[PDB]
Design a protein around this ligand. Structure first.
Ligand SMILES: [Mg+2]
Lengths: 465, 107
DNA sequence: AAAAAAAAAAAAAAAAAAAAAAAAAAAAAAAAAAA
DNA sequence: TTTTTTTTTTTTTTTTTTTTTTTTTTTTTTTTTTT
């Protein structure tokens, strides 16, 4: 995904529609005076790729990214980026049949942002999954060194140095999804446990009361048949026009008073069981029996579902660990060789922490000569810049991300190492689009494309120098 | 009942049940107070907590005001309730009150 | 020609992550006293 | 003259709360297709 056009509308120092074209796929270099808008170009690229923590875009809010906080006529802030797809090997999934991919993020005042791909709207998970497939994740980057953060890559905790190798291996998108999966499964597990204890306390007691009144309803239906036989015989015998004669000549000579008090003693049980049990309890108990059986089948399938998901993530963790070790060996070898080529008579390796495992975190260890540095706090800003640059280029040598953004990685390097970094990006590390902001001429004089940035009339312009 | 949906249901039910009993020769003598208590109930439901019930009340009042063979006394009270509720908190109840005022001004 | 269905937008409430601030513990450095 | 003890200061790590943004649910509005 080589960037071909970048369209910035209403961003931090950009008040108009600025369209930057003529991007060379090998090495682009942004220059200009101080306060011109170079890091705002890189902040626009970070913003179109998606940020959560707005301190890396240098804002305290989202309306702080619009021009003059949106209170100067430009009430919207939209960033458009266009990617070329003549190389289908680094193309994302599903977008192979489109030679150009446009992504735009818009934010207006008051509300929050909204994304669109190729003109058509999309939520943030779609564009985040689009950019997390060519390892262009901004929320945990292995390609973005912002301004003043080149001498601080070696100050990182071992989980972050592990996460860079994890993003190179391809398993960081599995790791954050696995942690989200465990959290979501815990929340749905306590919800299902509340539902199970509600089923145990509130349903089956009422179900056995329903079974009790079911068997009393069979008794009441026996008395129902008793009424519609005996009371029919009774009202036939006091009615006495030929059918009543035919139903008299089967039971000739039934005693009147005993039949009358038997009718009364049947009707008193009837006026009791009329307010005892409802006459439609059989369809009701069939309905709630089907509901309880389907409910318990659902709970069993949910439990087997959780067991299958848990055993599958436990099986995937082993392949994650094996590809992490296989990535880490090649990356630390190329780390040592690139640091030996940049700074002569030196070496650097990535080592698992003392006593713990490789998948717990990694630490940089630096050799200058034949002595091992016990702590890397005693190194200069230029040496730490070279170790950080050699680590990022080792991650390039494993699996090259398409866009490497470097905001002033040469602020602590001398005039020899700056020209050597420019030469090694122009010659050796082909295979990625480099967007470097520099002020030292030895870096952007070895460039294939140079964009000057200037401040005029209240806005910023980008001129192809 | 604390559910919003059942309150909006029964408010729309009163609105549709007054709005259909407008053809004359069986309405104003067969049921006279059962329809007046529902008109008064739709007037009282302008003050419910969730604004969807207020919106359903105003919409029922606006579909009452179309067919007028009777209850022309109630239209002035609907006008008073609409100009009172023209400055509520939700935009939905305000917009539907503008629609109700336009409906009673056209007719 | 009208009605129904689907998609998008709006409002209110809740949750998660990051940043800033605060507190506690550990280590280092300096000064003084005693054998 | 050296070691030990006490006090003070600084740095790092961990914890807590709030804010902003995002997500979820329901309802409303708009557009398109079918009877
Ligand atoms: Mg800058």
């Amino acid at each position: 995904m080589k960037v071909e056009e970048l369209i910035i509308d209403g961003f931090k120092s950009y008040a108009t529609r600025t369209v930057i074209t003529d991007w060379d796929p090998q090495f682009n270099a942004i220059t200009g005076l101080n306060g011109s808008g170079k890091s705002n170009i890189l902040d626009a690229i970070c913003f179109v790729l998606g940020i959560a923590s707005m301190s890396t875009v240098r804002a305290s809010s989202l309306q702080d990214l619009i021009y003059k906080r949106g209170q100067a006529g430009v009430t919207k802030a939209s960033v458009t980026i266009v990617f070329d797809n003549t190389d289908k090997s680094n193309s994302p999934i599903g977008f192979t049949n489109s030679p150009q991919i446009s992504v735009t993020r818009q934010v207006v005042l008051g509300g929050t942002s909204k994304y669109l791909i190729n003109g058509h709207r999309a939520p943030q998970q779609s564009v985040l999954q689009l950019f997390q497939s060519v390892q262009l994740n901004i929320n945990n980057p292995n390609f973005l060194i912002m301004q003043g953060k080149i001498t601080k890559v070696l100050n990182m905790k071992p989980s972050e140095i592990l996460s860079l190798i994890e993003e190179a291996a391809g398993t960081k998108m599995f790791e954050d999804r696995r942690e989200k999966a465990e959290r979501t499964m815990s929340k749905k597990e306590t919800k299902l446990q509340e539902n199970r204890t509600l089923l145990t306390e509130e349903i089956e007691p009422k179900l056995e009361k329903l079974r009790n009144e079911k068997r009393m309803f069979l008794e009441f239906q026996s008395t129902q048949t008793d009424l519609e036989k005996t009371e029919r015989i009774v009202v036939s015998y006091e009615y006495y026009f030929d059918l009543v004669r035919n139903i008299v000549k089967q039971n000739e000579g039934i005693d009147l008073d005993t039949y009358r008090e038997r009718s009364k003693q049947l009707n008193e049980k009837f006026q009791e069981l009329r307010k005892k049990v409802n006459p439609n309890i059989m369809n009701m108990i069939e309905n709630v029996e089907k509901k309880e059986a389907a409910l318990k089948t659902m709970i069993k399938t949910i439990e087997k579902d959780k067991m299958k998901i848990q055993e599958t993530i436990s099986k995937l963790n082993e392949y994650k660990r094996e590809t992490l070790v296989k990535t880490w060996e090649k990356v630390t070898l190329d780390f040592g060789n690139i640091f030996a080529d940049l700074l002569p008579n030196s070496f650097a390796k990535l080592v698992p922490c003392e006593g713990k495992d490789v998948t717990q975190g990694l630490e940089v260890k630096v050799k200058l000569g034949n002595i091992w540095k016990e702590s890397l706090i005693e190194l200069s800003g230029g040496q730490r810049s070279l170790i950080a640059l050699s680590l990022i280029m080792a991650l390039l040598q494993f699996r090259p991300a398409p866009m490497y953004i470097l905001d002033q990685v040469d602020a602590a390097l001398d005039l020899s190492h700056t020209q050597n970094i420019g030469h090694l990006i122009k010659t050796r590390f082909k295979g990625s689009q480099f967007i470097v902001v520099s002020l030292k001429e030895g870096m952007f004089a070895n460039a294939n494309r140079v964009f000057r940035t200037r401040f005029q009339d209240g806005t910023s312009v980008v001129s192809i120098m | 009942n604390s559910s919003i949906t059942l309150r909006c249901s029964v408010v729309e039910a009163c609105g549709n049940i007054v709005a259909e009993l407008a053809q004359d020769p069986q309405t104003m003598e067969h049921y006279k107070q059962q329809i007046a208590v529902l008109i008064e109930l739709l007037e009282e439901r302008f003050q419910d907590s969730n604004p969807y019930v207020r919106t359903k009340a105003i919409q029922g009042c606006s579909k009452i005001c179309d067919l007028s063979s009777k209850f022309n006394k109630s239209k002035a009270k609907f006008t008073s309730l609409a100009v009172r509720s023209l400055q509520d908190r939700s935009s939905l109840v305000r917009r539907n009150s503008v629609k109700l005022l336009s409906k009673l001004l056209l007719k």
